[PDB]
């Protein structure tokens, strides 16, 4: 057609009056030429972004072949047109349409080094493990070319994307030719974030294996142990402890990874938490703690397992306004650590009176054994608070009590020195004739660590 030989013309000399006077007289929009070359494609060769504009608003077909599968989207990204490039995009082009030899917009972007475009192709979708019909990804070929920027800017997006498929081999040998492990995306999510979202624990091993910044934060300030706390992945949350992940990590909204795994039912991963160091205590914005919001939740047995490690620990530490506070909550007075120890051992091995007052106040048992007999008598006879030795004795403590080896309250007295205590001990009705399993009474005792007062009193009370 010489409508359409005059419109093919047209466009690829940059005559835009031509163009519109040729479509009004009726010429095809979509003409092509020998070679299957549409106005559209020649506009974009040639960079007339007016044109471009024009043939598309009078139904060019922006993805259009010729004959070696070249959309008017190669064109524009081999010659370096930005803007051609972005409105070819909007009006539907394949980002990722390849030729007969599998040539996409990226390979050309990348081979001859057009920064921008590259960033646009990668920002609608173009995809960074395209090969050509040789086995070249755009990468590849900005290597060769000695786009050496720009194939940087290919590693860091496709680790970010094998990092979140999980494809190991890809890691590999991603970092292999200088991927950059500690890149970030437009959110501020780096590559351990994604394996660690997604529960890729041979990509975490890898990712730190290879420097990976195990405490990476994004925009909204949230770490890879955040995300595995979140997920619920209890081994990857391990192995980022082990690699020196922190585990008491806030964010903009103050939640740490304990608030996450308490809100989100992980039991598991709230006692991993625990026993690395994770504050029971800590706050957020809304003013919660993670034994809040594992209560809204109704998880019970993480709320009260919260509480169980709060009560110990504060009662071992001495803060009392904790432990009442603690207790109006609902925490179990005898819970017991591993040992066996119950918050009231831990008061009276300390010293703290006041709190071995609060607690048997709220029902704490006063003859309480850890896993080899030691009442809290045995702690507060061992260590000499003459106070707490009295307290217990009021509430009912058991003043022969013995433990596994025999050992009563008045041999650790008279072991230690503690004359004061050894006759309240002996007021309360103490045995002075008990011996432990190695056939030593508490004079004995006294003897053998040079107490002489009160092997003197113990002898008299025979």
């Known amino acids: 057609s010489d409508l359409g030989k005059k419109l093919l013309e047209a466009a690829r000399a940059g005559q835009d009056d031509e163009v519109r006077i040729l479509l009004a007289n009726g010429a095809d929009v979509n003409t092509a030429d020998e070679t299957g070359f549409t106005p559209l494609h020649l506009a974009a060769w040639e960079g007339?972004?007016?044109?471009?504009?024009?043939?598309?608003?009078?139904?060019?077909?922006?993805?259009?072949?010729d004959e070696r599968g070249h959309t008017p989207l190669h064109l524009a990204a081999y010659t370096g047109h930005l803007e051609i490039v972005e409105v070819l995009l909007?009006?539907?082009?394949?980002?990722?349409?390849?030729?007969?030899?599998?040539?996409?917009?990226?390979?050309?972007?990348?081979?001859?080094?057009?920064?921008?475009?590259?960033?646009?192709?990668?920002?609608?979708?173009?995809?960074?493990?395209?090969?050509?019909?040789?086995?070249?990804?755009?990468?590849?070929?900005?290597?060769?070319?000695?786009?050496?920027?720009?194939?940087?800017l290919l590693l860091a997006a496709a680790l970010l994307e094998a990092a979140r498929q999980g494809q190991r081999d890809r890691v590999e040998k991603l970092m292999a030719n200088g991927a950059d492990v500690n890149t970030a995306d437009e959110?501020?999510?780096?590559?351990?974030?994604?394996?660690?979202?997604?529960?890729?624990?041979?990509?975490?091993?890898?990712?730190?294996?290879?420097?990976?910044?195990?405490?990476?934060?994004?925009?909204?300030?949230?770490?890879p142990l955040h995300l595995a706390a979140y997920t619920g992945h209890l081994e990857?949350?391990?192995?980022?402890?082990?690699?020196?992940?922190?585990?008491?990590?806030?964010?903009?909204?103050?939640?740490?990874?304990?608030?996450?795994?308490?809100?989100?039912?992980?039991?598991?991963?709230?006692?991993?938490?625990?026993?690395?160091?994770?504050?029971?205590?800590?706050?957020?914005?809304?003013?919660?703690?993670?034994?809040?919001?594992?209560?809204?939740?109704?998880?019970?047995?993480?709320?009260?397992?919260?509480?169980?490690?709060?009560?110990?620990?504060?009662?071992?530490?001495?803060?009392?306004?904790?432990?009442?506070?603690?207790?109006?909550?609902?925490?179990?007075?005898?819970?017991?650590?591993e040992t066996g120890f119950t918050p009231l051992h831990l008061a009276a091995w300390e010293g703290h009176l006041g709190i071995v007052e609060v607690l048997l106040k709220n029902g704490a048992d006063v003859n309480a054994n850890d896993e080899r007999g030691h009442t809290p008598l045995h702690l507060a006879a061992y260590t000499g608070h003459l106070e707490i030795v009295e307290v217990l004795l009021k509430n009912g403590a058991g003043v022969n009590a013995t433990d596994v080896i025999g050992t009563a309250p008045?041999?650790?007295?008279?072991?230690?020195?503690?004359?004061?205590?050894?006759?309240?001990?002996?007021?309360?009705?103490?045995?002075?004739?008990?011996?432990?399993?190695?056939?030593?009474?508490?004079?004995d005792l006294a003897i053998d660590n040079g107490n002489e007062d009160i092997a003197e009193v113990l002898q008299k009370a025979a």
């Open 90 to 152: 909007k009006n539907g082009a394949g980002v990722n349409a390849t030729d007969v030899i599998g040539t996409a917009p990226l390979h050309l972007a990348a081979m001859w080094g057009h920064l921008e475009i590259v960033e646009v192709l990668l920002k609608n979708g173009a995809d960074v493990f395209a090969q050509d019909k040789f086995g070249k990804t755009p990468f590849d070929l900005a290597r060769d070319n000695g786009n050496e920027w720009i194939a940087k």
């Open 410 to 443: 008045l041999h650790l007295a008279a072991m230690w020195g503690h004359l004061e205590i050894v006759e309240v001990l002996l007021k309360n009705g103490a045995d002075v004739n008990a011996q432990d399993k190695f056939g030593k009474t508490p004079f």
């Open 187 to 223: 959110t501020g999510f780096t590559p351990l974030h994604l394996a660690a979202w997604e529960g890729h624990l041979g990509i975490v091993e890898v990712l730190l294996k290879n420097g990976a910044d195990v405490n990476a934060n994004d925009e909204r300030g949230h770490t």
């Open 236 to 337: 990857i949350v391990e192995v980022l402890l082990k690699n020196g992940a922190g585990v008491n990590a806030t964010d903009v909204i103050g939640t740490a990874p304990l608030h996450l795994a308490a809100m989100w039912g992980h039991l598991e991963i709230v006692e991993v938490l625990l026993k690395n160091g994770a504050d029971v205590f800590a706050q957020d914005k809304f003013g919660k703690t993670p034994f809040d919001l594992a209560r809204d939740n109704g998880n019970e047995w993480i709320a009260k397992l919260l509480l169980a490690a709060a009560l110990l620990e504060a009662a071992r530490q001495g803060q009392r306004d904790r432990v009442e506070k603690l207790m109006a909550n609902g925490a179990d007075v005898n819970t017991a650590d």
């Open 48 to 65: 007339h972004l007016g044109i471009v504009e024009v043939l598309l608003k009078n139904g060019a077909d922006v993805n259009a072949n």
